[PDB]
């Protein structure tokens, strides 16, 4: 019953440990026991206990004082404030013992904590003058003892204890508030997660009560700039983020303070608010946008900030928003649009990354507008940007189109990617074109796929591509083929004995290859290094020899690039990998072609795949044949296998004309060694070729004849068995049955000129000319129309046309005019044109048939003109009459005739005098005709310039390509035009002018290398010559000289660089002008 300094230390403790129990068990109700123990309660607070050096005593006394507050509440016994302060500070010092969870006394310290927490004893200190020091020291203690050794009951009691002080207190000083917020600072949060969790629990529990002091904290430092208020002033933004996640209400009055800070003129401060709000808005569970719309709208406005880092931050933020907040995606579309056009490359680039990143997670997170933005960026001016957009669309295709990762309806949303990506191959940029190739190899038709799967993929892809897409893909095949050949040529040059000559040849080849590589400024120098390595390392040569061989499988190729890359193991090694991936076969080899033809075979008989693969079995078959036809030109050797030829044989006996027509064309292009390596195929093929060659159809008969010529060494005797029977069947009584025989004979006459020289010569002279072209057994119906579909043409006309094409092939076979046989045919074709198509002039022939005969004769001369030996024979008068076909009364005639000129000129096989004909298209009423004529001129003038740019010129071969040399021909052609009758007439000379201006406007558009000076020097020279078609004819030379002055008037009035010196003295055509004053214009011009 007594505890004092008199008793032994042992007995005192013994008494205390009993006094703890009675105080613990006592009740607030027991007035009796309270009045009794009241004096002991007052005594236990004595300074003898509060400062007792024994740890166990202070603990026991602390527990007592706690219950003593519990029992006597709400009216404690200790009244002295100075004494009441000593107690609660003493208790706080004891709470330090909570830290050692392994001590045997811990549970007593826990009882102390549990008691003051339940009783809210510390609330007594609200009235004490030093309340803030007490509460601050309490908070620091609790946050410094909490560790991973404490269960949730400890955490809970500490929150209860600290919550009361805030909720039921008069105020919260900044100092006291800081003891809580400091635990949230990132540096502290990192080293002490326990104190951090405790602070969160506290702030959450007391959110309503503490909001004003938090609001006051931020308002002082953000708005009023007072940093001295707290040592946590630097961490405000870190704290606002932490606080928002604990409870939104904590920032009730802080969000308006952020909205104000967005309007700040301080770029760095404005940036930080945006960085912050990005995390707040962007977070997955966040709902700040719905809860505070004005802040959301005020935030989105920063997408248009002048400061680049703020824009960049908003753009990076968009990715997270798109992924985490689909419903907010619509508020971003307009801002992502304008930023895709940003002046800063970094912003344009990151708009793509954000849209793609969202798309790759789920395509439904991005709409059509956002993908269209990525599309628009493939045409960006910066390579790094369009590189990002193309790769983006590739990765999207591979997921949501190839693999259908989001269903079938989603794959139709992006059906445009495959086409658009391949259209990029038409770009001038070498970097772009080579990237399309990498994309095609990785993302569209993955190379790592097994052969059969890889061609199944390609087959259905090729069947669903745009028209320009498949064209791009064909051009890609062709370019690699050309490059592989250039490399094999280089290797062969290196293998030669090294002379000064081969050294130069090697440099030329190197220079050509580098034009097909990125960064030609470094490629030229890297290929110098490359040739050096090849001359030395024989083992690297071998590996490249294998990689470039036409029988290189895709497997071997992967091995070859491996070995070469190894033995060169830095920007140099990067360059060669570009070269190696271009030439290395990835898709097409011998086994692939076999798999692909088998895939088309399947499609023809059942297959069941076409329907579920999303393509009509019809167009899939047609595409597969076109694909094989294309690959037969680019990869012919790859068709050389037993499996492929066996598959092609079955295709050749299908009864489907389009399938058989394709198989024949493929055999023609790849069957060069069938007879040697596959004799059973050869013998199986013979009977079919003879059948098709005899019974048609025409198209297949043609291909059959060329197949025999290509494959069989015995082709001579083969042709005999075919020709002689077909030679007999030629009877004018049968018209319908003469089509196929005439076709077959024509191609035989082309491929076997000497073997059948005499029968053909007689055949043409008697049957074609006299018996067939001179009669009209079946007069076509009389009509007003000038043209009819192929169906409605009289079968006799169709035979005449085919008989004309036969004569041309008969001449192209001979390639000589020795026996004056070419003159005869050219004389005949001319009379057909001069008689408007009615060779007999009896009027029994139909008008549409006459049109098709004019077109046939006009087309014939143009084809013969492409053969040098017959070009010599074509007289000016014949050529001039042929030229007038470009202005035929019939639209179809002039259209197709023009198409034939374009084709002859595009292949650089038709002389420029035939390009001058296009000048007469200025007389064409039809807009479409004038457009095509100009199109023809532009394309033909350019390719002739680009060709001369690369290739070294030669005396006679240079005049043939220089576009400027069209002007003399154009001047001559117009001077002889039928409409130009009266020499000095105005309206006729207005016509001559617009014709000249039709070609000159295009020819002069470049204006480089003294083009204009060169032209005027030609025109000057013409005035010093004679018409050559009639040198003595004065009136004819007057007409020549005046057309020159009209031409001269155009040049003078449309340029300023004409008066310069000509680079070279122009040589006029000898057969248009003889070897070399005033103006011949009427003054009204």
């Amino acid at each position: 019953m007594e505890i004092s300094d008199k008793i032994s230390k042992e007995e005192m403790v013994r008494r205390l440990k009993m006094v703890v129990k009675t105080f613990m068990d006592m009740d607030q109700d027991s007035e009796e026991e309270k009045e009794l123990y009241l004096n002991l309660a007052l005594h236990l607070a004595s300074d003898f206990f509060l400062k007792h050096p024994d740890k166990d005593v202070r603990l026991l006394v602390a527990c007592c004082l706690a219950d003593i507050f519990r029992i006597y509440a709400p009216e404690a016994p200790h009244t002295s404030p100075d004494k009441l302060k000593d107690i609660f500070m003493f208790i706080t010092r004891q709470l330090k013992g909570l830290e050692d969870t392994k001590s045997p006394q811990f549970n007593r310290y826990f009882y102390l904590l549990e008691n003051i927490a339940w009783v809210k004893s510390y609330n007594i200190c609200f009235e004490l003058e030093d309340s803030n020091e007490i509460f601050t020291q309490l908070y620091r203690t609790l946050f410094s003892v909490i560790n991973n050794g404490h269960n949730q009951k400890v955490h809970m009691h500490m929150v209860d204890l600290m919550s009361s002080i805030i909720c039921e207190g008069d105020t919260v000083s900044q100092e006291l508030l800081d003891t809580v917020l400091v635990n949230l600072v990132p540096a502290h949060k990192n080293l002490n997660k326990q104190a951090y969790d405790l602070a969160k629990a506290l702030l959450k529990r007391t959110a309503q009560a503490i909001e004003p002091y938090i609001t006051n904290f931020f308002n002082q430092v953000l708005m009023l700039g007072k940093t001295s208020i707290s040592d946590l002033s630097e961490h405000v933004f870190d704290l606002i983020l932490e606080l928002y996640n604990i409870d939104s209400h904590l920032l009730l009055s802080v969000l308006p303070q952020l909205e104000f800070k967005l309007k700040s003129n301080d770029n760095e401060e404005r940036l930080q608010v945006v960085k912050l709000l990005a995390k707040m808005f962007g977070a997955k569970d966040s709902e700040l946008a719905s809860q505070n719309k004005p802040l959301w709208q005020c935030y989105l406005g920063r997408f248009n900030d002048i400061h680049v880092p703020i824009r960049l931050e908003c753009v990076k933020f968009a990715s997270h928003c798109l992924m985490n907040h689909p419903d907010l995606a619509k508020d971003l579309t307009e801002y992502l649009k304008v930023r895709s056009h940003d002046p800063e490359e970094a912003i344009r680039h990151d708009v793509i990354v954000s849209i793609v990143t969202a798309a790759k997670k789920d395509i439904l997170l991005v709409n059509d507008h956002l993908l269209n933005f990525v599309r628009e960026r493939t045409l960006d001016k910066r390579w790094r940007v369009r590189k990002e957009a193309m790769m983006g669309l590739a990765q999207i295709y591979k997921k949501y189109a190839l693999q259908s990762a989001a269903g079938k309806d989603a794959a139709k949303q992006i059906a445009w990617i495959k086409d658009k990506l391949l259209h990029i191959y038409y770009q001038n940029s070498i970097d772009d074109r080579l990237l399309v190739e990498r994309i095609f190899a990785q993302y569209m038709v993955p190379h790592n796929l097994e052969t059969t799967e890889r061609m199944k993929c390609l087959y259905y892809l090729y069947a669903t591509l745009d028209l320009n897409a498949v064209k791009a893909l064909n051009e890609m095949w062709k370019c690699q083929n050309l490059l592989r050949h250039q490399v094999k040529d280089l290797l062969d040059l290196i293998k030669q004995p090294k002379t000064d000559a081969s050294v130069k040849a090697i440099f030329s080849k190197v220079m050509v290859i580098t034009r097909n590589l990125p960064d030609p400024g470094k490629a030229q120098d890297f290929m110098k290094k490359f040739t050096q390595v090849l001359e030395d390392d024989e083992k690297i040569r071998k590996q490249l020899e294998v990689l470039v061989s036409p029988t290189c499988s895709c497997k071997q190729a992967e091995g070859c690039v491996r070995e070469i890359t190894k033995k060169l193991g830095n920007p140099f090694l990067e360059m060669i990998k570009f070269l190696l991936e271009r030439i290395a076969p990835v898709h097409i080899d011998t086994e692939s072609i076999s798999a692909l033809i088998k895939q088309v075979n399947k499609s023809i008989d059942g297959t069941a795949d076409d329907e579920d693969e999303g393509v009509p079995t019809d167009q899939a078959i047609r595409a597969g044949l076109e694909l094989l036809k294309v690959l037969s030109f680019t990869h012919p050797i790859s068709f050389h296998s037993a499996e492929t030829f066996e598959s092609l044989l079955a295709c050749l006996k299908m009864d489907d004309e389009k399938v058989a027509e394709a198989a024949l064309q493929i055999f023609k292009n790849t069957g060069s060694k069938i007879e040697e390596d596959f004799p059973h195929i050869r013998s199986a093929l013979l009977p079919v070729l003879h059948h098709k060659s005899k019974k048609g159809p025409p198209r297949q008969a043609k291909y059959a004849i060329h197949c025999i010529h290509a494959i069989f060494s015995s082709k001579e005797t083969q042709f005999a068995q075919i020709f002689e029977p077909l030679h007999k069947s030629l009877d004018p009584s049968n018209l319908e049955h003469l089509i196929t025989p005439l076709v077959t004979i024509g191609h035989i006459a082309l491929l076997a000129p000497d073997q059948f020289a005499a029968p053909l010569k007689s055949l043409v002279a008697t049957f074609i000319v006299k018996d067939l072209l001179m009669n009209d057994r079946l007069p076509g119906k009389k009509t007003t129309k000038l043209w009819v579909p192929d169906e409605e043409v009289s079968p006799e006309t169709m035979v005449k046309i085919q008989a004309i094409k036969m004569m041309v092939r008969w001449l192209l076979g001979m390639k000589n005019n020795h026996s004056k046989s070419g003159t005869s045919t050219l004389r005949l074709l001319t009379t057909i044109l001069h008689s408007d198509g009615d060779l007999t002039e009896q009027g029994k022939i139909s008008k549409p048939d006459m049109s098709r005969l004019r077109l046939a004769a006009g087309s014939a001369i143009v084809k013969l003109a492409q053969e040098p030996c017959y070009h010599e024979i074509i007289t000016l008068e014949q050529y001039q009459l042929c030229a007038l076909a470009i202005n035929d009364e019939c639209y179809q005639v002039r259209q197709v005739f023009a198409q034939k000129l374009h084709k002859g000129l595009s292949r650089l096989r038709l002389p420029l005098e035939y390009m001058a004909i296009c000048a007469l298209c200025a007389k064409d009423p039809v807009k479409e005709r004038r457009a095509h004529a100009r199109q023809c001129l532009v394309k033909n003038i350019n390719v002739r310039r680009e060709y001369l740019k690369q290739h070294a010129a030669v005396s006679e071969k240079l005049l043939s390509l220089l576009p400027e040399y069209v002007v003399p021909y154009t001047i001559h052609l117009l001077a002889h035009d039928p409409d130009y009758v009266k020499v000095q007439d105005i309206e006729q000379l207005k016509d001559v002018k617009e014709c000249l201006w039709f070609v000159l406007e295009i020819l002069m558009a470049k204006n480089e290398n003294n083009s204009h000076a060169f032209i005027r020097k030609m025109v000057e020279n013409i005035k010093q010559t004679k018409d050559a078609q009639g040198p003595d004819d004065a009136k004819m030379n007057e007409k020549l000289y005046t057309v020159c002055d009209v031409a001269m008037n155009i040049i003078m009035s449309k340029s300023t660089t004409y008066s310069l010196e000509s680079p070279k003295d122009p040589v006029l055509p000898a057969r248009f002008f003889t070897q070399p004053t005033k103006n011949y214009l009427p003054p009204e011009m």
């Binding site: 509440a73 709400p74 339940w118 809210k120 609330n123 609200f126």
Partner: peptide, 5 residues
Amino acid sequence: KTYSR
């Protein structure tokens, strides 16, 4: 019974 305000 406890201390509250």
